Design a protein around this ligand. Structure first.
Ligand code: WWO
Ligand code: WWO
Ligand code: ZN
Length: 258
């Protein structure tokens, strides 16, 4: 009776196994755009993905993960709110059963169809596992997805999903360039938060881009054909794998623009 997204194990239940669910810096949050304050001291984010080396795509049960080589300093995220160098190691998405829901963060209560998370660990902690135990160990770049025109750079992800339909399946996924998932602008909001699902560690600097990307209905529809279950178990479509917005508590959201 493991955690998930259903009635019987979803977000309202997680605090029993993971009490930090009720912590002081949980994610996601609603981004109140009128209250987020431009911070002229923030830097223009540096997203350097030219040398990224994707490895594999894995159905982890609650999502799929695209994993990268994080054994040498390749793709990194720096600048903005960050002190030091964060190494890209994985991306994944959250999405809905319907185009009108799926994002974790919201913008003035608006929900997007999906949200892309590019996860990076702070190289000063040596490993991902070490980093995850630090309040500045991770930086996650969040990008909203709206349904409209297709995103060319997403299609290779969509097309491999039939090969990893069920929990525990993996496929080779080399030579994928995550630069094809980024919007034109790097304007962002930032705040201190957490992993958005168990174990909910309070280890993340969130950087949420203002500009969504456009994906087609057919692209998101293929995400909704994935399965939460393993092969040979009853089929449960992998949809609505988002945590709702959590209390902001003692935090300020800071804007890089305007
Ligand atoms: N796909 S991913 O690269 O984000 C990932 C996970 F999703 C994940 F769940 C884990 S896990 O080991 O915490 C639990 C397995 O479901 C690791 N672990 C990587 C790691 C651990 C210690 C030191 C360095 C890396 C992990 F790397
Ligand atoms: N949605 S999120 O970006 O905050 C997030 C999680 F919420 C999260 F729980 C994980 S996880 O691997 O701990 C559980 C399975 O997804 C990762 N994956 C990246 C990561 C891996 C290890 C430690 C910290 C983050 C993760 F990226
Ligand atoms: Zn996520």
């Amino acid at each position: 009776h493991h955690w998930g997204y259903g009635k019987h194990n979803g977000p309202e239940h997680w605090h029993k196994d993971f009490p930090i669910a009720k912590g002081e810096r949980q994610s996601p949050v609603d981004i109140d755009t009128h209250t987020a304050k431009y911070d002229p001291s923030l830097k223009p984010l540096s997203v350097s993905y030219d040398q990224a080396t994707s490895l594999r795509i894995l159905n982890v049960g609650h999502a799929f993960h695209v994993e990268f080589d994080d054994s040498q300093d390749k793709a990194v995220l720096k600048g903005g709110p960050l002190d030091g160098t964060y190494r890209l190691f994985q991306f994944h998405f959250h999405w809905g059963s319907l185009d009108g829901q799926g994002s974790e963060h919201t913008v003035d209560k608006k929900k997007y169809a999906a949200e892309l998370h590019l996860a990076h660990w702070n190289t000063k902690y040596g490993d991902l596992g070490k980093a995850a135990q630090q309040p500045d160990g991770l930086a996650v770049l969040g990008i909203f997805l709206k349904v409209g025109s297709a995103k060319p750079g997403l299609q290779k992800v969509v097309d491999v999903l039939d090969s990893i339909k069920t929990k525990g399946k993996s496929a080779d996924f080399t030579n994928f360039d995550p630069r094809g998932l980024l919007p034109e602008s790097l304007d962002y909001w930032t705040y201190p938060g957490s992993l958005t699902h168990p174990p909910l560690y309070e280890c993340v600097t969130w950087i949420v881009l203002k500009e969504p990307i456009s994906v087609s209905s057919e692209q998101v529809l293929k995400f909704r054909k994935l399965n939460f279950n393993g092969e040979g178990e009853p089929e449960e479509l992998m949809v609505d794998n988002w945590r709702p917005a959590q209390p902001l508590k003692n935090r300020q959201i800071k804007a890089s623009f305007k």
